[PDB]
Amino acid sequence: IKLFSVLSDQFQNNPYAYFSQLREEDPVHYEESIDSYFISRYHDVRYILQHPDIFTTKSLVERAEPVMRAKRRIVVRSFIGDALDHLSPLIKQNAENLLAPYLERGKSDLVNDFGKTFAVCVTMDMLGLDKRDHEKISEWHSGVADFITSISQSPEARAHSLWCSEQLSQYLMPVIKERRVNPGSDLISILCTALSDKDILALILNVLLAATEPADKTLALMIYHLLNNPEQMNDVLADRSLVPRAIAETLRYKPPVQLIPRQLSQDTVVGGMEIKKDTIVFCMIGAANRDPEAFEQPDVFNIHREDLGIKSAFSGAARHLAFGSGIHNCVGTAFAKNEIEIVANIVLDKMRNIRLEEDFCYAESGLYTRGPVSLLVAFD
Ligand code: HEM
Ligand SMILES: [Mg+2]
Ligand SMILES: [Mg+2]
Ligand SMILES: [Mg+2]
Ligand SMILES: [Mg+2]
């Protein structure tokens, strides 16, 4: 009951089976393993995200370090909002260039054969990095992600993770010193116009981390749930203007980012239980997006739901909390919509009569960020 742990293999197997017992029965669940509380109720979670004075979180220029173990937001957001119209042909090519090898076979794994690389490549365009280097970059990003997400690492993984983030610095740092004097129109160049080299590397790195994982996760998650609800897929195929709805419901239904940490600046009460200073709470987004106080039939994937509030699903005043909520809302919400919309449409254009593979076994993994282990599809 309160004896159960949200860091367990058991929980990590299927977080969705325990959210309900978590609200209603132990909403502000203490995690003995750390000095961290886990908050499962929608309205609590949302109050926490709306009030980042009481519940602070790291700056964009703060080098990330393992989650388990304020004016630039706009400068990023806008110069990401100005970016997306420019990067749409490049996102489109990436999708086409990366699908290209797999057509003809009529067989792909949208996660491992395509997704990861696609997202990596879109971010590399956002940062103006040379897409020849996408193998190195992916491997490096992954090693770092591994260090941030993980509960624990072996000395090897940790030694690899250190290496990866060493390599990235060796790679990006010369690009930063270059663009300071010869800036293109890419994000790195823009950041050089009022922060230090190392500051900018941190921001760049946090934008590398932020903009990659969730985007490939969502693509795969949406396609999977559309295929798992095939008339909703047909709905989307016959009217492509539903893709924002399919995207939004996927985000509500299986948020790629499951946990949003916040540090407590003071003593304060969320719900009923009292929590002391400097302790860190964890917003359980999965649990909040499945809360029947916010959504009706919450455990039903329905792209046509009336309370989705599609009108706003890709903003800070949204109904689901997959981008967070309010002032500290995902900086690339507008970007994320476009990116996924584009690629989805191409995936759907090129993979005619797309379906799941014979004897494919769906499986999610992740505690802090969660998505499919793979998505084995077949098509003409
Ligand atoms: C599938 C779509 C995406 C989802 C669900 C998502 C989710 C999130 C969430 C939950 C946060 C936490 C905000 C908070 O602390 O309350 C966040 C932060 C952030 N997001 Fe996103 N994201 C997505 C795509 C993107 C993309 C494509 C970009 C960049 C274009 C982006 C840029 C950022 C940045 C820069 C942060 C700040 C984190 C930091 O301080 O390092 N996101 N995102
Ligand atoms: Mg080591
Ligand atoms: Mg389903
Ligand atoms: Mg159906
Ligand atoms: Mg499932």
Instruction: Provide DSSP, 7-44.
Output: TSHHHHH-GGGTHHHHHHH-SEEEETTTTEEEE--HHH
Element containing residue 260 per DSSP (H, E): strand 259-264
Q: Which helix (H) or strand (E) holds 345?
A: helix 333-350
Q: Structure resolution in Å?
A: 2.7
SS3 of 150, please? coil
d(CA 255, CA 332): 15
> Which DSSP symbol is given to 224?
H
Write phi, then psi, for 44 (nearest 5 degrees): -65, -60
Segments of 102-252 assigned E as strands: 107-109
CB neighbour burial string for 183-220, b if at least 16 within 10 angstroms, e if fewer: eeebbbbbbbeeeeeebbbbbbbbbbbbbbbbbbbbbb
Could you give the angle at which helices 333-350 and 197-227 cross, rounded to 10 degrees? 40
Place of tokens 């029965």: 25
CB atoms near residue 287 (< 10 Å): 28
* Burial of 330 from C-beta contacts in 10 A (0-12 / 13-18 / 19+): buried
User: Which ligand sits nearest to residue 74's alpha carbon?
Assistant: 1
Query: Up-side HSE of residue 128: CA atoms within 13 Å toward CB?
Result: 17
Q: Which of the listed residues 59, 127, 190, 323 should we mutate to test ligand 1's pocket, taking the one with most ligand atoms within 8 A of CB?
A: 323
Work out whether strand 280-284 and strand 36-39 pair parallel, antiparallel, or are unpaired.
Answer: parallel
DSSP state of 241: G
Measured distance CA(45)–CA(321) in Å, rounded: 9
Separation between Cα atoms, residue 113 and residue 376, nearest integer Å: 9
Our CA angle for 156, 206, 290, nearest 5°, is 95
- Cβ count near 64 (within 10 Å): 16
Cα torsion angle, 108, 12, 204, 158, sign: negative
1-380 sits in which CATH class? mainly alpha
Ligand nearest to the CA of 254: 5
Name the residue of 58, 221, 331 whose CB sits within 8 Å of the most ligand 1 atoms, as the mutation to test its pocket.
331
CB 335 within 8 A of CB 81: yes
The torsion angles phi and psi of 53, rounded to 5 degrees, stand at -80, -45
Q: How far is the CA of 72 from the centre of ligand 1 (A)?
A: 14
**Ligand 1 atom at minimum distance from 59 CA:** 40
Q: What is the H or E stretch that residue 146 is in?
A: helix 134-149
Domain definitions of the chain by residue range: 1-380
Give the integer Cα–Cα distance in Å for 354 and 318: 31
Which experiment gave this structure? Answer: X-ray
